[PDB]
C-alpha cells in the first residue's frame, strides 16, 4: 500500500514495507491546539495504532487514504 507520510517536507507518499498494509493518521492536541489545531502524524502500519484516551487515530487500507486534513484522499 502507498501512504501519505509526515516524515517529509512537503508531505509526500511512500510505499509501505511488506506486511504493512494500512495507512494511518494520528492527531492530538499540544499547547498550540487552540490556534493551530491538532498535531498531525501520517504513516504506515501493519496493525492500527492502539486507541489512546487523548489521541485520535484513523487507519485505512487504500492508497493515500490518510491525507493531511487540508488535502483530499486518493
Amino acid at each position: 500500500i502507498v501512504c501519505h507520510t509526515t516524515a517529509t517536507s512537503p508531505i509526500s507518499a511512500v510505499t509501505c514495507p511488506p506486511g504493512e498494509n494500512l495507512c494511518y493518521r494520528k492527531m492530538w492536541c499540544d499547547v498550540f491546539c487552540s490556534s493551530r489545531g491538532k498535531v498531525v502524524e501520517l504513516g504506515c502500519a501493519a496493525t492500527c495504532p492502539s486507541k489512546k484516551p487523548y489521541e485520535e487515530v484513523t487507519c485505512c487500507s487504500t492508497d493515500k487514504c490518510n491525507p493531511h486534513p487540508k488535502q483530499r484522499p486518493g
Binding site: 509526515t6 492527531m27 498531525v40 493531511h68 486534513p69 488535502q71
Partner: peptide, 13 residues
C-alpha cells in the same frame, strides 16, 4: 518539523 491540521506547511521542532 511538526505538522498541524491548520496548514500543509510544517512548523519548527
Amino acid at each position: 518539523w511538526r505538522y498541524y491540521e491548520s496548514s500543509l506547511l510544517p512548523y519548527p521542532d
